[PDB]
């Protein structure tokens, strides 16, 4: 039992920032940082506006007095409002005393983050997930979950990277960064939008193989190597993402810890793809995991 | 379609209670509730002591001044101490305003809880665990993690059920309730301890198969049915826990949601046990998952 486990970041710093935002009877979640509340702009939609909302026209009919923002049941009065891409920015009359040190970041495909799933401004649960190559997430969300956020924590600083907006017909999820710019080609309206065909996150498969070596499972290592270009051409024929120069460097620490060169681990993965596992397991499993990152492996080696 | 994830409870209410406890050069985590700090008693051991500790002897050799308790950058003054089973209770001269409504619960095998893994008094990660039938937990704990706690939240009440103490040679973990009594046959000493042979938590496998159907993965359903007794015969043959009628009752709501009678899901599981998965996956897993309770599935899927 290796102890390598998917973990969420402790959510308390984000819990202290969750509020509910209501227009009429539509309620979703918002993020309260200093004296601003961020939330998805479709809170202003009625059922008849959802199919193809004219958000600019809808917001013309709205005043500060139209928005009910609550921390629990305590109202926070709105003193200003504007739209920023697919988000509303609501200025409120109170600076959140629980505001952590924070940044807004744009996540890249293959990277992971924690999601604090919230309903009516009340946190329900926290889980880890990855941004897929096709710019969706395999989340877990019910009605009322919009405005739940995704985040990473680095020491004392919360990096917010995702705000939740919609579900796609295949049951995966789409959303924006905290500037309101969607990840992927998606738009916030009540229409069926197909995601592109997904691929396997090669960087994380390689991390998982390094994790298996660290734990003493090494049957899949070989005495051969590959060039990066040759590997990437084979990868794409197996619907694996190509490796980038950044990916190779991210794997530096695991390569150094194990003494297995990145391109030698790529050669091992190429052999697994072409030959299959033919029965065997890796870290107790028959299929290769692709949502456990190099950062996760390294972090969980020692205390 | 909701999707389906291993989901922990939000950890904020517990994070506000974590402190660091040091005695000599041993440091671990404590739980600060009102004016009491709870922590594993082996904080009082040196390296040598841990091989065969006489804890009553070791503790009478300490005073209040022997314990350094720190809440971030602030030392808390220890003004009394006592031992209850394998925990220490340190009385401090400050009350924690962040104390949630709470209770102490001893959980039963099959039940799940969230773990807030902490190092040097600082929260690092949160994940979901089940109490195994053999009274271990398959955790992720490194040096410095002792005193990390497991918990559930109902309404606004935190039910603490686990405090972490040790790792076994197999890599699984053992600890206590918040009364200091170990789950299982384990003892807090630096020796290699084996657990009893584990079994699979049938009620949870069934709840997870229902979660799979709710999310549209239903290849394992079939036309067969079974009685409860004939299911339990096969279950026990395969080292699965028997199902009681009270357990069938618990699955009622998931049954009504999917329209799949509990005993029909049992017949599906019986076939999975006898035939294997034939290389197929359920909710992306190549094995039958038994660390989701019915409540965990309902929480997420309704
Ligand atoms: C917290 O103090 C610490 C947590 C463990 C360290 C590694 N993973 C853990 O979960 N607990 C311990 O170090 C205990 C202290 C004893 C006095 C109870 N000891 C422990 O976990 O030792 C694990 C060893 C035991 C011998 C072995 F061969 F089985 C290898 C594992
Ligand atoms: C906001 O809470 C909500 C979250 C979704 C509800 C169920 N799961 C979710 O993730 N968001 C929405 O309901 C959006 C609102 C738009 C105006 C942005 N709509 C949405 O997600 O539609 C989902 C449907 C639409 C396409 C489909 F018909 F193919 C099936 C999914």
Author numbering:
A (entry chain B): 0 to 302
B (entry chain A): 0 to 301
Study text:
Next, compound 7j was cocrystallized with SARS-CoV or SARS-CoV-2 3CLpro, and the structures were compared to that for MERS-CoV 3CLpro and 7j. In the SARS-CoV 3CLpro-7j complex, the backbone of compound 7j formed direct H-bonds with Cys145, His163, His164, Glu166, and Gln189. Compound 7j also formed an additional H-bond with His41 and a water-mediated contact with Gly143. The electron density map was consistent with both possible enantiomers at the new stereocenter formed by covalent attachment of the Sγ atom of Cys145 in the cocrystal structure of SARS-CoV 3CLpro with 7j. Compound 7j was cocrystallized with MERS-CoV, SARS-CoV, and SARS-CoV-2 3CLpro. Superposition of compound 7j with these 3CLpro enzymes revealed a similar binding mode among all three proteases. Compound 7j had a moderately lower potency against SARS-CoV 3CLpro and SARS-CoV-2 3CLpro compared to MERS-CoV 3CLpro in the FRET enzyme assay, suggesting that moieties forming H-bonds that were accommodated at the S4 subsite had an important impact on potency.
Coronavirus 3CLpro is a cysteine protease that has two N-terminal domains containing two β-barrel chymotrypsin-like folds. The polyproteins are processed by a 3C-like protease [3CLpro or main protease (MPro)] (11 cleavage sites) and a papain-like protease (PLpro) (3 cleavage sites), resulting in 16 mature nonstructural proteins, including an RNA-dependent RNA polymerase (RdRp). X-ray crystallography confirmed the mechanism of action of the inhibitors, which involves formation of a covalent bond between the active site cysteine and the carbonyl carbon of the aldehyde.
